[PDB]
Design a protein around this ligand. Structure first.
Ligand code: CA
Length: 279
């Protein structure tokens, strides 16, 4: 399948070269997979989700996304026009308030929830968790992400946005999950993207158009915009039988475009996520 006048980042992950504008993907597009966006909530009523999203857990007085951040991230995973895995199921887990902040014990409660809740859903091709959130290093939060991945959910996390070695942030630094830095549309590391050997992969994270609240759209930036591109790609590749939750980070990094990016510090991977699609 081909989606013309795609957002650049979609086009970028189905190409070996920058600068095109079409998104090439297999029509399965994540059917039978499930992605949990752990964030500020999702606006499931948004036309772009077409009945495929719902909110399953909050830790605040409301399940609603009053911020926008989680609706944007969910749109990059799953929306009809803006998403990578257009047919996946999209679950919302509100661990962040409507200004975007949480306490680490609630973020920890949220990961534990998905490890349990996946068994109450119908995800025959598998389960991904996307966490466009980070703080300073906390062993407790690293261990929760490790448990979530161990349970059989493919965990993808934002490297962080401080232009620093991600070893000092969590859960970016946990080795067993899939740590995601961000690139721009000319194949440079984004200016804010954390780096270092704990990174696994880069994805598009500068000027990312996606769904916003109030039934709208907006183009925003961050490693949190790069992370759901990778999460959606994992959902896609599990529907195709190409990998499993345990080893989708390894398959993505192995099948990536290698050596395209500029502005990569020695010691960091130079790998940009690719979907391996040949029509
Ligand atoms: Ca890894």
């Amino acid at each position: 399948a081909a989606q013309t006048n795609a957002p650049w980042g979609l086009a970028r992950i189905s190409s070996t070269s920058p600068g095109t504008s079409t998104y090439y993907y297999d029509e399965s597009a994540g059917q039978g997979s499930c992605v949990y966006v752990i964030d500020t909530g999702i606006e499931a009523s948004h036309p772009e989700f077409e009945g495929r999203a719902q909110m399953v857990k909050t830790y605040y007085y409301s399940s609603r996304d009053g911020n926008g951040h989680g609706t944007h991230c969910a749109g990059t995973v799953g929306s009809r026009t803006y998403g990578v895995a257009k047919k996946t199921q999209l679950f919302g887990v509100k661990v962040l308030d409507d200004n975007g902040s949480g306490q680490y014990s609630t973020i920890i409660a949220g990961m534990d929830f998905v490890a349990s809740d996946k068994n109450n859903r119908n995800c025959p091709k598998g389960v991904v968790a996307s966490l466009s959130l980070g703080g300073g290093y906390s062993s407790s939060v690293n261990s929760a992400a490790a448990r979530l991945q161990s349970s059989g959910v493919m965990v993808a996390v934002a490297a962080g946005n401080n232009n620093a070695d991600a070893r000092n942030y969590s859960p970016a630094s946990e080795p067993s999950v899939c740590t995601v830095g961000a690139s721009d549309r000319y194949d440079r590391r984004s200016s804010f993207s954390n780096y270092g050997s704990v990174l696994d992969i880069f994805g598009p994270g500068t000027d990312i158009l996606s769904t916003w609240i109030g039934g709208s759209t907006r183009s925003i930036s961050g490693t949190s915009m790069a992370t759901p591109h990778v999460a959606g790609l994992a959902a896609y590749l599990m529907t195709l039988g190409k990998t499993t939750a345990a080893s989708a980070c390894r398959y993505i990094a192995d099948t990536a475009n290698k050596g395209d990016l500029s502005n990569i510090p020695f010691g960091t991977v130079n790998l940009l996520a690719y979907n391996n699609y040949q029509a």
